[PDB]
Design a protein around this ligand. Sequence first.
Ligand SMILES: *[C@@H]1O[C@H](CO)[C@@H](O[C@@H]2O[C@H](CO)[C@@H](O[C@@H]3O[C@H](CO)[C@@H](O)[C@H](O[C@@H]4O[C@H](CO)[C@@H](O)[C@H](O)[C@@H]4O)[C@@H]3O)[C@H](O)[C@H]2NC(C)=O)[C@H](O)[C@H]1NC(C)=O
Lengths: 49, 388, 145
Amino acid sequence: IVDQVITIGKHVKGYHYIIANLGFTDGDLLKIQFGGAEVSGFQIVDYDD
Amino acid sequence: NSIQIGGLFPRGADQEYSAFRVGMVQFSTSEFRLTPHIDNLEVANSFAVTNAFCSQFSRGVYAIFGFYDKKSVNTITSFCGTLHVSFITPSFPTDGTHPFVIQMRPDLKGALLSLIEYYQWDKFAYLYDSDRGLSTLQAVLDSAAEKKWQVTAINVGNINNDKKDETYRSLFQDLELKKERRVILDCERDKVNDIVDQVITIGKHVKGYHYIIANLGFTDGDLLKIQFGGAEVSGFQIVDYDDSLVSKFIERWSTLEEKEYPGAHTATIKYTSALTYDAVQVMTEAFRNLRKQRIEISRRGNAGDCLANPAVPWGQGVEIERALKQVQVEGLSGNIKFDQNGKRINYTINIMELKTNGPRKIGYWSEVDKMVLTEDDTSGLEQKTVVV
Amino acid sequence: TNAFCSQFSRGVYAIFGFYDKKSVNTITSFCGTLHVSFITPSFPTDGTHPFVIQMRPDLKGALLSLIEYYQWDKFAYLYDSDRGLSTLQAVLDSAAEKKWQVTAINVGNINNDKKDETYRSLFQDLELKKERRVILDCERDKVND
Ligand SMILES: *[C@@H]1O[C@H](CO)[C@@H](O[C@@H]2O[C@H](CO)[C@@H](O[C@@H]3O[C@H](CO)[C@@H](O)[C@H](O[C@@H]4O[C@H](CO)[C@@H](O)[C@H](O)[C@@H]4O)[C@@H]3O)[C@H](O)[C@H]2NC(C)=O)[C@H](O)[C@H]1NC(C)=O
């Protein structure tokens, strides 16, 4: 879905995407890291522990 | 019969050498066969270029077909001009007048200029490459005073692959100071793909932006990634796949085995490879005209070292050059004919506009006619005009 | 190339000479492989090149710092093609970092017969923007003209 959002260019400033799963940091986020859209998610495996 | 010809290729040339072999097979008549001596070496190092040129000269070649980079242009031109050796190259044409060189690639500066005239651009960005030659950059800089444009030229060529992601993002953040939406990329397809990837990463490929690819390899690079972004992409293509000749050539090209001929099974061919094929054709027709006019070419052996205190250039090479420049044939690049200097005259460069369906032939340009073909939609798709 | 290989066959230890826009690539690639020392007072090569000693210092930063000192925002740049486009590329790249409107004209490729006409037409074309600040990147012999 993120790849498709990138292809259509709907990941720029203004858009807001919330990932509704406990796998936020396991998947690569660098492709939308610089798009502009504010992405938010959830993580159960805190690597800082 | 067996005409020894030189074949200097870069080590990274694969589809170009494949098209050279396909052209060698297609035009190997029983009247005479062209035997090529292939030398794969580093195109950048001018010392190795000089060594290979003097090796071919010591072997006794009649016409050298090769490529060159910004370092080797002067050595090749100054060696072929003095030693009277014929040279054929699909690379970028030399700036000015240079003899004994047949540049298969046509002149694209007027094409980009006429396209800017058609789009009516007054302020845009120009990301240029240093290795591709500053000829087009000088032409647009000189036109920036005749027609008064505010162009922002950036040398993106000198970037390191380690700091690649950082330099490109900083470049586009610096280009957002003027809020630039119109960008022209004067780079090779291999680098244009990276620039497009970075534009996709930063999200500057949405509606509003306009990107012009300033090279004859528009369809060679993958355009489907920016096909649906929203930004109107436009470029230039010399190898028109809609041609019946090009279609019949691609029919055999795709069916060829990928193991023996590298990069041949594809349906799209790079413009450099097609220009290599057409150069082989032009060489064959040149030697055929030399046989038709009963002009005997012969070396008997070798005159000696290219380096000499008495400069000894063999005369018959002039006739070979004249026969090369006189040939007017039809090939993958369209109409192929050369003038007294060796540049391409009377050519057909198609202007493509990437829509949602894909690459669309929006027009074509020539040396005499600027922006002719107004085919398909003539501004009549989704307009919605309410009659009051 | 002929003179360089003649000196190499003679047995020189270090060659002191000059080069033009055409021959530079031949010299650098010949001294680099044959490990022969070269010294030249001409313009420095763009980038890093070994076995070459350029006596001339780098002037790009001097012109850039002088433009910063004079506080110029819109000017003309009449450059020479034979003298190398290094300074022109440096000022074009700085024209986005510091945002300048530079009008670069290639005055280098002009004929001595049509000299007065090409120059008068160039300055008449530069009066469209009413440019008063001009930078001349040419050799002294041409700067006098
Ligand atoms: C289809 O193709 C035809 C042949 O290729 C072409 O006819 C050519 O037309 C052009 C312009 O009309 C002619 O160009 C001139 O060439 C002569 C020398 O041959 C010169 O008068 C001049 O160039 C000179 O040579 C140098 C060029 O760099 C330069 O140093 C000189 O100062 C001077 O400029 C013109 O450029 C050309 O000769 C014609 N060819 C022939 C064989 O007669 C058709 O126009 C073309 N048609 C279409 C529709 O494309």
